[PDB]
Design an enzyme around this catalytic site. Structure first.
Site, short mmCIF file in Angstrom:
data_model
loop_
_atom_site.label_atom_id
_atom_site.label_comp_id
_atom_site.label_asym_id
_atom_site.label_seq_id
_atom_site.Cartn_x
_atom_site.Cartn_y
_atom_site.Cartn_z
N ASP A 106 28.42 -5.27 -67.12
CA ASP A 106 28.34 -3.97 -66.47
C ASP A 106 29.14 -3.94 -65.17
O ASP A 106 29.83 -2.96 -64.89
CB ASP A 106 26.87 -3.61 -66.20
CG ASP A 106 26.64 -2.12 -66.14
OD1 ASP A 106 27.59 -1.38 -65.80
OD2 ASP A 106 25.51 -1.68 -66.42
N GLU B 46 24.80 -7.89 -65.21
CA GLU B 46 24.14 -7.19 -66.30
C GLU B 46 22.96 -6.43 -65.70
O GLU B 46 22.17 -7.00 -64.95
CB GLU B 46 23.66 -8.16 -67.38
CG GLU B 46 24.79 -8.90 -68.07
CD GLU B 46 25.46 -8.06 -69.13
OE1 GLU B 46 26.46 -8.52 -69.72
OE2 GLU B 46 25.00 -6.92 -69.38
N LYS C 196 14.10 -8.71 -71.80
CA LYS C 196 15.51 -8.42 -71.59
C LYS C 196 16.07 -9.32 -70.50
O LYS C 196 17.21 -9.79 -70.62
CB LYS C 196 15.70 -6.94 -71.24
CG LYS C 196 17.14 -6.53 -71.05
CD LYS C 196 17.97 -6.85 -72.28
CE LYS C 196 17.54 -6.01 -73.47
NZ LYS C 196 17.91 -4.58 -73.29
N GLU D 265 24.13 2.53 -63.87
CA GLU D 265 25.18 1.53 -64.09
C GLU D 265 26.03 1.34 -62.85
O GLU D 265 26.05 0.27 -62.23
CB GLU D 265 26.06 1.95 -65.27
CG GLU D 265 25.51 1.62 -66.64
CD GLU D 265 26.61 1.49 -67.68
OE1 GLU D 265 27.79 1.34 -67.29
OE2 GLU D 265 26.30 1.56 -68.89
N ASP E 90 -18.19 -29.46 -75.92
CA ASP E 90 -19.08 -30.47 -75.38
C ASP E 90 -20.32 -29.79 -75.90
O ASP E 90 -20.25 -28.83 -76.67
CB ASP E 90 -19.17 -30.80 -73.90
CG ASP E 90 -18.14 -31.82 -73.46
OD1 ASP E 90 -18.36 -33.04 -73.64
OD2 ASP E 90 -17.08 -31.42 -72.95
#
Ligand SMILES: [Mn+2]
Length: 1453
Positions: free
Chosen positions: A89, A102, A115, A51, A1050
């Site tokens: 974040d 993010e 995500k 993070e 075809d």
């Protein structure tokens, strides 16, 4: 146990970086021993590491304290109460902008990209609120695919995850067991048939696995099948003399065909025979062909360029008026001292004002501010501000020039200035056949409609007058609506002349400079049909007809005119052919309206009667070639969806019609409800029940022949509201044209559509939330209901609206939560039912492809389902690779198909060139499941598995959920409400009626789908086997086995001799055979289309027609494509695409002289864009058929070998010496030293001195051509590197390429942007530089040794020699295609390795991954960043077989 806990406790604070925020969690992790606390602490710290690591990498402050977006706004004092609840974040707030980060780390590609997409959607959701709040969002998320981070070395975190992994296993042994979140942890990192899921297959995959075995006998003997075939036939044949239908198959008398075609449409097209009569009708059909055939007959005009360049900055009502005084003023100091459309001074934006609304806008804009004293108060400020946009971004010399015209303005001169020029049919000379100026006026009345999307919004006589230039005299346009929509145009001349018509600019690009290509196409054509019966005075007849046809088609382009001229191929294919469907003449009829279309009919019939009339079988080959080409003449119409919505309703209808007759079960659930099981039970029951007299068009497979097929393969013989209503209700009496009101009432799909959950439902709903903005609006509608009662205490819609709206109100009235953004992936496969893999149920969505005849369906689904479907579509591909009949992607098989076709056709055996019909909606995954779970593949545990994976991906596809596209449902609800408030309702308009009496459709799910293209290899496998079986039924009954082929839609059937002697001998048998082959296919799901034939001399396998021997060239097919395909790109690539398409063209028999003309057209387009033609732009416009044995290299070398004829005479023997002495004994590396590529190109001098004889500085310095991408690429790091990295509308493209390539596009050594204008004039006028042309300006003929005040601005450093770029090429062309490229007139991985062999760029070429002389050629390619010497053969496929006119191999160098 304890040891791992101690290891973690001593590892966290001894191996991780010491941060202030990390310590808070580090200490609590160290202070615990119990496994659950240990796991939660370790996972949370592992989350926080990434993070803050990524938040700091972005530089945006991390949200450690869990600050909300509203919190982030309010901590800076911004008060915006009410916003979507988000927790970014990483965040960085500024005065008027916001950056949100993010972050997430995902291992599997699918979950990662997922995500990614919903994070993008979450960011975009608050876009408008952030914008209107006075700030803006910096769109960015941190999609990381690894755990390497600043806070810890890789080994530390890797061992950390190892310890957590092992402690997960220990906990799972204990009672820390988690149902399946334990799986999401562990296999969530601590293709090839993922089998790691559980199995929940119960009480549904047994009924489905039973119906596939109830009735079938998949083991019948080898001679118990013959007895079944012989009793399915002769139980048909004897029911043919009375029962069904005479086979739908009849013979042909060509005269009957022609007369039946003639008598079509008994109504209005009624045999207007006389040629002159038809042409006289033609020249008067629309309003526009009424001009195209009519026989009519710089101080200013540059000031607009300056007045226009400063326009994109601002545009308001108060502006664009005093921006027009500066123009009317210029129109008085040039006529008094002496265009103008007679009340209108052409103002800035292609706009056109009135000389009387101006000169009155002033004197009340000016007077509001002594008028002569008040003179100049704005005409001077405007000059000052426009010149304020000075050399700032290079405001050029045009500035003081206006300071001469404008200040001549007076209030004794604006008393009449507009008062002076106060002046506010044709016919149709038909003799305009063959007169090149009758299309040369289209090629200039389209460019005046094409460069018309190029207007702007720009907020009587307010009419966007473009200009119809032409030799000398010039007309106008007059219209009022911009964009790409329709509007009513006009024309104007010296007399008024309102030739109004209605067209669409996007449709008119084909003729936009092609006046000499069409006139030779339609002239070559008539050089085929110099035939003996027509030598009488009918060649002129045909010529006038064909030209008067092409004029109608180009001049009135529309879908019907395409479908018609396309269908006219079936009729000719039939007339040369020998059998044909009997329902044919209903496959040719449209609903012709708009007299142009009827006249197209009459012209077609006239052509057919003339060419195919009497005296047949004499030159029918040539007539056939002529007519099939006239059929393909349809491609001249653009394939670009006349409208959107009326081309989405059509696609949905073509999807949904068979489901109307079979079953559908609108909007299923994620858990298969009992009703769905009942409906699928019923549908399987019907699907497997189809008697031996089938209804002939309905889906079904009969379990009495299907048994024969499966058993002959298993045997070895066939091988080798409470708010919704109220919101609409309150405004209804607050909103009290009315068709906007009808939209308002049809905006009512909120009390009828609320499906799914996920993302189903896709602005005034939120606008009323901010519009009202009152005190108490989010509780029950008690207040709202009170107003309605207290209110009452083209009008009927209002009363019934209150009736409807009153009706509405009455009836209406813990897991890792935080670590979700962290290593934990929320969704992923686990235990799966037989419906779906437990995440979803194979969702889909459909949209239309774009084609010539009819828009074809396309199914597109999100990436996980696109991953799963790959397993089926590859398993079946590998399966069919063992069988040798199919031809879809086995390309090597296509060549053998062609060879067999030709050996057949050459002799006279049949070719039953069938084509199957409704191949999409008459195939069902149920059928492949039936076909698979009945086959008996070999030994177990390696085949026996993966069969139970294909046969459970299929069972997944069974229950798919296609989506009703939102515009379609909106339109059908509009239609329903219109009908109900106030017939012709098609079937799919009534289902909406029933269901919207209740609940709206969203999703549809039924057995008979076979998503078009989705399983398009499973379908090919099925078709291949079924044809290999039917061509066995026929063999056992009649006595011959006819081979087949397939494409998945075809086919062909090359019957041998013994079934061809019969058609001449007796057709009454072969008629039965073509009935029977059409019948069994009916029993299975294969419905032969009425477009099939059985032509004893003709063929049609994937659009490659034939005749006795050779191939029909299809000239118009390739010309119609080359004249298209002009895309907005770098012109050094836009002219690469065409130099490919022309090689494609000359692959077939387009003659060289038209090829040159196509190329000249493209060059002429560029030259119209005002882009200098450096000798490397588009290939030689003097070509031998030398498109064989020559790459793009040879064309460009041949060009430079004639643009400078005798200088490139020495630098061709220097290269001869270099090649003579490079392969054998020398250089091979020291040549890179002498390449000297670091520094200037004296290399020519030193390298001539190295081994060879006198070479002046002239032949090097003199020829020097301007090169725009010299130092950087130009705006809109070698080339081959970019290409290898890449291998990890069309009339609004040109109208944009001509807008960017004229503006600041070129770049300088210091990131400086210049124009082409100043740079291309300085090299011509402002030096001792000679800049004359040879059809392409080879600027600066001399640049003596470049001895000069070099780098003046750029125009001297920015131009490289020629006789060197000739050397490097004319070398690369000498190992790649032989030695002779000097005498006087392989694959991706390789190139990557020899790029690595100098390792410096590999550091950039490597990370995108998630011979003898090849080194030198790769080097020469990497330096020459303009064309292709190697990177070509790895982007554009060459062709294999070349045949072109033998009169072009005679004029060769
Ligand atoms: Mn075909």
């Amino acid at each position: 146990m304890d040891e791992i806990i101690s290891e973690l406790r001593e590892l966290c604070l001894n191996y991780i970086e010491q941060d202030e925020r990390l310590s808070r969690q580090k200490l609590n992790f160290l202070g615990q021993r119990e496994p659950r606390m240990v796991l939660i602490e370790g996972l949370k710290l592992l989350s926080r590491c990434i993070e803050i690591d990524s938040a700091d990498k972005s530089g945006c402050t991390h949200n450690h304290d869990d600050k909300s977006v509203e919190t982030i706004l309010v901590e800076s004092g911004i008060v915006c109460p009410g916003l979507p609840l988000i927790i970014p974040d990483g965040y960085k707030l500024i005065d008027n902008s916001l950056i949100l980060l993010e972050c997430f780390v995902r291992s599997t590609p699918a979950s990662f990209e997922k995500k990614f997409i919903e994070d993008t959607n979450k960011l975009a959701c608050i876009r408008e609120d952030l914008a209107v709040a006075g700030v803006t969002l910096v769109p960015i998320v941190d999609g990381r695919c690894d755990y390497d981070n600043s806070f810890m070395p890789e080994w530390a975190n890797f061992k950390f995850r190892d310890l957590l992994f092992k402690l997960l296993e220990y906990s799972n042994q204990n009672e820390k067991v988690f149902e399946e979140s334990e799986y999401f942890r562990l296999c969530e990192s601590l293709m090839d048939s993922m089998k790691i899921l559980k199995d929940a297959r119960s009480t549904h995959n047994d009924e489905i696995m039973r119906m596939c075995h109830e009735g079938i006998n998949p083991n019948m003997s080898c001679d118990d099948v013959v007895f079944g075939i012989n009793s399915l036939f002769s139980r048909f044949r004897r029911d043919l003399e009375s029962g069904k239908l005479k086979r739908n198959f009849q013979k042909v008398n060509p005269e009957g065909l022609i007369k039946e075609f003639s008598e079509l449409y008994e109504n209005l097209a009624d045999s207007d025979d006389i040629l002159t009569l038809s042409r006289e009708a033609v020249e008067s059909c629309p309003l526009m062909r009424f001009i195209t055939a009519e026989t009519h007959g710089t101080e200013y005009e540059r000031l607009l360029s300056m007045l226009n360049k400063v326009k994109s900055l601002k545009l308001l009502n108060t502006r664009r008026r005093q921006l027009l005084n500066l123009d009317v003023l210029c129109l008085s100091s040039l006529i008094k001292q002496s265009c103008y459309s007679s009340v209108n001074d052409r103002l800035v934006s292609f706009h056109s004002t009135k000389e009387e609304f101006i000169r009155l806008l002033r004197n009340r804009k000016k007077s509001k501010v002594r008028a002569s004293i008040s003179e100049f108060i704005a005409k001077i400020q405007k000059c000052l501000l426009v010149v304020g946009l000075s050399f700032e971004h290079y405001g050029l010399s045009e500035h003081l020039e206006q300071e001469c015209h404008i200040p001549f303005t007076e209030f004794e001169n604006f008393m009449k200035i507009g008062a002076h020029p106060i002046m506010y049919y044709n016919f149709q000379p038909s003799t305009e056949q063959l007169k090149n100026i009758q299309s040369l006026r289209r090629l200039s009345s389209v460019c005046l409609a094409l460069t018309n999307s190029m207007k702007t919004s720009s907020v009587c006589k307010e009419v966007f007058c473009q200009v119809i230039k032409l030799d000398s005299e010039e007309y106008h346009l007059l219209y009022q609506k911009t964009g790409e929509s329709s509007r009513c145009y006009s024309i104007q001349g010296p007399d008024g002349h309102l030739i109004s018509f209605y067209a669409d600019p996007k449709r008119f690009f084909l003729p936009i400079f092609s006046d000499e290509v069409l006139y030779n196409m339609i002239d070559i054509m008539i050089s085929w049909i110099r035939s003996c019966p027509d030598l009488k005075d009918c060649l002129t007849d045909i010529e006038v007809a064909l030209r008067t046809l092409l004029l109608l088609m180009l001049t009135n382009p529309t879908k019907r005119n395409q479908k018609q001229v396309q269908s006219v191929r079936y009729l000719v294919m039939a007339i040369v052919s020998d059998f044909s469907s009997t329902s044919l003449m209903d496959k040719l009829r449209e609903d012709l309206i708009t007299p142009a279309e009827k006249v197209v009919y009459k012209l077609l019939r006239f052509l057919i009667k003339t060419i195919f009339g009497t005296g047949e079988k004499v030159l029918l080959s040539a007539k056939f070639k002529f007519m099939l080409n006239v059929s393909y003449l349809c491609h001249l119409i653009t394939k670009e969806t006349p409208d959107r919505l009326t081309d989405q309703i059509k696609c949905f209808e073509k999807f949904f019609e068979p489901k109307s007759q079979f079953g559908f079960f609108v909007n299923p659930k994620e858990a298969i409800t009992p009703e769905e099981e009942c409906v699928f039970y019923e549908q399987m029951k019907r699907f497997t029940s189809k008697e031996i007299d089938c209804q002939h068009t309905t889906p079904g497979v009969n379990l009495e022949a299907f048994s024969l097929m499966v058993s002959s393969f298993n045997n070895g013989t066939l091988i080798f509201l409470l708010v919704s209503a109220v919101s609409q209700i309150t405004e209804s009496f607050v909103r009290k044209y009315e068709y906007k009101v009808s939209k308002l009432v049809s905006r009512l799909v909120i009390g009828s559509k609320g499906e799914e959950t996920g993302r189903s439902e896709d602005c005034f709903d939120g606008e009323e939330e901010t519009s009202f903005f009152k005190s108490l609006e989010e509780k029950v509608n008690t207040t709202i209901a009170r107003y309605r009662r207290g209110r009452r205490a083209h009008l009927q819609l209002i009363l019934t609206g209150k009736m409807a709206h009153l009706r509405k109100v009455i009836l209406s009235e813990m897991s890792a939560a935080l670590k979700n953004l962290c290593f934990y992936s929320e969704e992923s496969p686990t235990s799966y039912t037989s419906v779906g893999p437990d995440s979803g149920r194979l969702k889909f969505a459909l949209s239309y492809k774009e084609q010539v005849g009819g828009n074809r369906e396309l199914y597109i689904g999100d990436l996980r389902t696109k991953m799963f479907t790959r397993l089926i579509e590859d398993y079946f591909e590998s399966f069919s690779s063992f069988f040798s009949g199919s031809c879809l992607n086995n390309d090597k098989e296509f060549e053998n198909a062609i060879l067999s076709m030709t050996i057949n056709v050459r002799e006279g055996f049949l070719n039953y060139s069938m084509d199957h019909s409704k191949w999409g909606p008459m195939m069902c995954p149920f059928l492949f499941l039936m076909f698979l779970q009945n086959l008996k593949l070999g030994d177990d545990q390696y085949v026996r598995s993966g069969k139970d994976h294909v046969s459970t991906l299929l069972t997944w596809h069974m229950h798919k959920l296609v989506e009703v596209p939102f515009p379609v449902v909106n339109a059908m609800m509009k239609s329903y409400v219109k009908s109900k408030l106030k017939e012709t309702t098609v079937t799919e308009r009534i289902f909406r009626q029933y269901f919207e009496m209740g609940i709206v459709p969203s999703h549809i799910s039924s057995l008979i789908d076979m998503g078009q293209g989705i399983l398009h290899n499973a379908s090919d496998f099925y078709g291949l086997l079924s044809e290999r079986f039917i061509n066995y039924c026929i063999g056992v009954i009649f006595g011959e086995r006819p081979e087949a082929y397939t494409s998945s839609d075809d086919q062909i059937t090359l019957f041998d001799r013994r079934l061809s002697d019969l058609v001449v001998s007796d057709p009454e048998e072969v008629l039965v055979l073509l009935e029977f082959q059409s019948h069994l296919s009916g029993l299975l799901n294969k419905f032969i289309s009425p477009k099939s034939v059985a032509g004893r001399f003709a063929a049609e396998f994937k659009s490659r027609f034939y005749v006795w021997g050779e191939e029909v060239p299809l000239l118009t097919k390739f010309v119609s494509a080359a004249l298209h395909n002009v895309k907005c790109k770098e012109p050094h690539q836009l002219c690469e695409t065409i130099d490919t398409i022309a090689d494609q063209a000359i692959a077939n028999g387009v003659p060289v002289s038209l090829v040159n003309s196509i190329q000249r057209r493209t060059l002429d387009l560029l030259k119209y864009a005002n882009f200098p033609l450096d000798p490397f732009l588009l290939n030689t416009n003097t070509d031998v058929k030398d498109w064989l044995d020559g790459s793009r290299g040879y064309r460009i070398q041949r060009l430079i070998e004639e643009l400078c004829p005798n200088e490139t005479k020495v630098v061709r023997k220097l290269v001869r010496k270099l090649h003579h002495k490079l392969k054998n004994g020398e250089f091979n590396e020291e040549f890179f030293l002498d390449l000297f590529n670091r520094d200037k190109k004296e290399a020519i001098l030193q390298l001539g001195d190295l081994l060879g004889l006198e070479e002046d500085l002239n032949q090097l310095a003199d020829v020097n051509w301007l090169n725009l991408n010299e130092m950087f690429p130009l705006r809109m790091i070698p080339s081959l590197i970019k290409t290898l990295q890449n291998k990890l509308c069309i009339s609004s493209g040109f109208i944009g390429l001509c807008k960017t390539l004229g503006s600041r596009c070129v770049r300088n050594k210091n990131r400086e942007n210049l124009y082409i204008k100043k740079l291309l004039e300085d090299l011509t006028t402002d030096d001792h530089v000679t800049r004359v042309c040879n059809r392409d300006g080879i600027t600066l003929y001399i640049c003596d040794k470049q001895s000069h005040p070099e780098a003046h601005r750029d125009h001297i450093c920015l131009l490289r020699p020629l006789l060197w770029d000739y050397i490097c090429i004319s070398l690369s062309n000498s190992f790649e295609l032989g030695v002779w490229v000097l005498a006087e007139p392989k694959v991706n991985l390789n190139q990557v390795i020899q790029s690595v062999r100098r390792l410096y760029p590999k550091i950039f070429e490597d990370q995108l991954l998630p011979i003898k002389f090849l080194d030198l050629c790769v080097l020469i390619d990497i330096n020459s960043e303009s064309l292709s010497l190697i990177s070509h053969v790895v982007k554009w496929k060459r062709d294999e077989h070349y045949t072109v006119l033998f009169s072009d191999l005679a004029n060769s160098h």
